[PDB]
Amino acid sequence: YILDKIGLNIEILESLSYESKLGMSFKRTLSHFNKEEVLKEIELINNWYFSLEIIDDLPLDSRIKSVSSAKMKFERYYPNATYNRVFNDILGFRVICKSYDEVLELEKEDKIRVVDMSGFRGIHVYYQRDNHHYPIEIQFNTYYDRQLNDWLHDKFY
Ligand SMILES: Nc1ncnc2c1ncn2[C@@H]1O[C@H](COP(=O)(O)CP(=O)(O)OP(=O)(O)O)[C@@H](O)[C@H]1O
Ligand SMILES: [Mg+2]
């Protein structure tokens, strides 16, 4: 299990799932959500991540989406985007694998959805407890895709 080897077994993935307070299923489209309240919730997720001790103990590169980056991503996708498709990356990790084969087997699990992309390249894995929790993003990248991604960063930004 590539996830269990990295630290991200199901108990950890579950205790990392932030339970929304917005009363809204994340299968609804952005049109149904109160932007003022969403942004507040992101502030609280921010505060919650910067106090977690289990992320410290994890051998992983991690990032929380800032309230400013969520606000941009919200307006960029309003009104007809699904919420669990836009805000599927609020908490995110980045790892390198020796191969992609064993990553694409995570599709066959429950609660794990996989988005293959092998300008850029790589494989994104999403754990979502249920439809009123935020999904955790995991970007996988062999050395071949990680150096192409980093090199494209230099000629873009
Ligand atoms: N899953 C991740 N794990 C670790 N670092 C990440 C991850 N995703 C993004 N980052 C880094 O954090 C920066 C900020 O990401 P961001 O502000 O949330 C927009 P980003 O996720 O890169 O693209 P969108 O998903 O389209 O908004 C990125 O430019 C990366 O350097
Ligand atoms: Mg992202």
Side-chain angles (χ1 to χ4, degrees), residues 1-4 6-20 22-52 54-84 86-110 112-155:
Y1 222 97
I2 184 78
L3 283 189
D4 287 31
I6 238 351
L8 301 170
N9 56 93
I10 309 284
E11 269 87 358
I12 286 289
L13 276 171
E14 198 133 344
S15 61
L16 283 183
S17 300
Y18 190 100
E19 180 205 358
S20 168
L22 299 170
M24 223 87 59
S25 168
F26 283 5
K27 300 173 88 303
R28 297 181 166 273
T29 56
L30 301 204
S31 48
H32 290 282
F33 290 82
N34 187 355
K35 191 156 151 260
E36 324 301 325
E37 311 294 313
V38 166
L39 289 183
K40 286 216 275 285
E41 182 136 276
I42 306 291
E43 257 179 284
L44 296 179
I45 290 164
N46 268 227
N47 291 2
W48 159 87
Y49 169 90
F50 291 129
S51 299
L52 280 176
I54 39 183
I55 49 139
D56 287 2
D57 290 70
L58 265 192
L60 281 317
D61 168 48
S62 43
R63 171 247 14 164
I64 203 77
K65 187 157 219 106
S66 68
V67 191
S68 295
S69 200
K71 189 190 199 165
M72 289 195 247
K73 200 199 237 263
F74 188 95
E75 314 172 344
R76 213 256 292 274
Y77 284 109
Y78 189 89
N80 295 121
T82 310
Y83 198 90
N84 57 44
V86 180
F87 291 82
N88 64 348
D89 71 329
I90 293 304
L91 167 57
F93 298 81
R94 251 179 195 173
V95 78
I96 289 174
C97 50
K98 274 142 217 93
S99 171
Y100 282 156
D101 310 280
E102 83 275 65
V103 177
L104 307 156
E105 265 78 272
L106 296 174
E107 194 38 293
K108 286 137 216 146
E109 312 305 310
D110 258 8
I112 290 162
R113 154 192 161 225
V114 178
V115 164
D116 183 337
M117 295 149 15
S118 52
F120 302 79
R121 299 169 203 250
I123 308 279
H124 290 42
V125 173
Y126 301 89
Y127 170 98
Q128 185 168 10
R129 203 195 178 237
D130 64 30
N131 266 312
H132 55 267
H133 286 78
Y134 286 84
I136 289 134
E137 179 177 89
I138 302 153
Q139 299 179 351
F140 284 86
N141 248 355
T142 65
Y143 73 79
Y144 160 71
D145 310 279
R146 180 68 81 126
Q147 73 202 350
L148 216 31
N149 285 7
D150 286 342
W151 180 83
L152 287 172
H153 286 187
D154 306 339
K155 68 148 284 220

CSV table of all heavy atoms in Angstrom, one decimal, residues 65 89 137 139, ligand 2:
chain,number,residue,atom,x,y,z
A,65,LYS,N,-4.8,25.2,1.6
A,65,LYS,CA,-5.1,26.3,0.7
A,65,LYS,C,-5.5,27.6,1.5
A,65,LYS,O,-6.4,27.5,2.4
A,65,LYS,CB,-6.3,25.8,-0.2
A,65,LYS,CG,-6.7,26.8,-1.3
A,65,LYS,CD,-7.5,26.1,-2.4
A,65,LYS,CE,-7.1,26.6,-3.8
A,65,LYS,NZ,-6.2,25.6,-4.5
A,89,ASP,N,-9.1,20.1,-2.9
A,89,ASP,CA,-7.6,20.1,-2.6
A,89,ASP,C,-7.3,21.0,-1.5
A,89,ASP,O,-6.2,21.6,-1.4
A,89,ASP,CB,-6.9,20.6,-3.9
A,89,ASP,CG,-7.1,22.1,-4.2
A,89,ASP,OD1,-8.2,22.6,-3.9
A,89,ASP,OD2,-6.2,22.7,-4.8
A,137,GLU,N,-6.2,15.9,-1.0
A,137,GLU,CA,-5.5,15.7,-2.3
A,137,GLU,C,-4.2,15.0,-2.0
A,137,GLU,O,-3.5,15.3,-1.0
A,137,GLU,CB,-5.3,17.0,-3.0
A,137,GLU,CG,-4.6,16.9,-4.3
A,137,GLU,CD,-4.5,18.2,-5.1
A,137,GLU,OE1,-3.5,19.0,-4.9
A,137,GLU,OE2,-5.4,18.5,-5.9
A,139,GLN,N,-0.8,14.4,-4.6
A,139,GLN,CA,-0.2,14.4,-5.9
A,139,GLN,C,1.0,13.4,-5.9
A,139,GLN,O,2.0,13.6,-5.2
A,139,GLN,CB,0.3,15.8,-6.2
A,139,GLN,CG,-0.9,16.8,-6.3
A,139,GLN,CD,-0.4,18.2,-6.6
A,139,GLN,OE1,0.8,18.5,-6.6
A,139,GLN,NE2,-1.4,19.1,-6.8
B,2,MG,MG,-4.1,22.0,-6.2
